[PDB]
């Protein structure tokens, strides 16, 4: 609905309700995660190498290719599996 | 503004245990290129002229 003559002052900088918006999005983000799986048994020693690529020596690989151990559906069997990762997710533990 | 990643990717499902799925990144079919973004030249220069003015 529109109004005539009445004139009010506003201030974006001490305005409220933005604070509760920044609260609410964080709370919605956290509520959208607890029904999903944890990734605890994944922190394990990774055997890694370079992906198959004709690499110039001065350039670095953006993809690393790693293999490791993981528990199967049972508790007794364990299997060897491989995957890909970016360089910004693995670091060097400290021959091989 | 356009942005794109061109590398074709294949997901893969490892099982952790009873009823737990986990998604790796499998094979890569194609050449390894680099994901990037494009914008137009003259529109960007003209809008920067606007904000300078």
């Amino acid at each position: 609905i529109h109004l005539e003559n009445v004139t009010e002052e506003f201030n974006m900088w001490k305005n409220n309700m933005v604070e509760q918006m920044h609260t609410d999005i964080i709370s919605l983000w956290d509520q959208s995660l607890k029904p999903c799986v944890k990734l605890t048994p994944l922190c394990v020693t990774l055997q890694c190498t370079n992906v198959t690529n004709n690499i110039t020596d001065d350039m670095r690989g953006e993809l690393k290719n790693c293999s490791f151990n993981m528990t199967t559906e049972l508790r007794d069997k364990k299997q060897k599996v491989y995957s890909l990762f970016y360089r910004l997710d693995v670091v060097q533990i400290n021959s091989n | 503004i356009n942005c794109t990643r061109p590398n074709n990717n294949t997901r893969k499902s490892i099982r952790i245990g009873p009823g737990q799925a986990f998604y790796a990144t499998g094979d890569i079919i194609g050449d390894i290129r680099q994901a990037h973004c494009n914008v137009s030249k003259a529109t960007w220069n003209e809008t920067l002229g606007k904000v300078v003015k």
Partner: antibody
Amino acid sequence: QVHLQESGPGLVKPSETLSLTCNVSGTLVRDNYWSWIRQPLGKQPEWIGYVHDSGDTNYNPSLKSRVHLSLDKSKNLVSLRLTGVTAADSAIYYCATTKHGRRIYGVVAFKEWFTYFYMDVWGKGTSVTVSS
Amino acid sequence: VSVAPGQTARITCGEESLGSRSVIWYQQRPGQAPSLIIYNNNDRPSGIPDRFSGSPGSTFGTTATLTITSVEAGDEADYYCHIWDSRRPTNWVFGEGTTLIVL
């Protein structure tokens, strides 16, 4: 019109320095990327390498140390030197010219492209046999 | 590898494709010097005849072919592929020969 000529001694003692020369016709040695090619009987031929002025002299990383390609701008020839030829290098040899080119797939500025070569014209060949 | 005269034969050579590749096809008559046929994937130099079908380079996970149509007795030549992939290093040796035995 162009044609070439392989030339070599042919009978080399084991562990010895081999040399080879390649004669030109018409097109001078400055113009073209040159190449040497080795082939034994019933085998795929082996690209020994390519040579040109201004550092365009990348070699085969198989041998890479005991072999020296070179040119001859005075007499307009193509020269090959080896060192320590053993019994494995019994083959016929070929000099050639080549034409290069660009293959481009992705972004140009990010070096997502490479160069290729192909040897257009061939020489005659020389049956170098290493023997004691 | 044998077909009737005037026909088309199918000739493949080398590894499966990985990325964008550039292929080179060379031929060689016996006793003589080597010789070019196809320099890009489907391009041939001037002075060379047609009817030599090559493969496109965009297809991934395939094998490079070479189809000869309207064959003859003069086409009896040892063939050599030379692949260049954008993922594998530089092949300093040539591919395996596929000798044709014409009818």
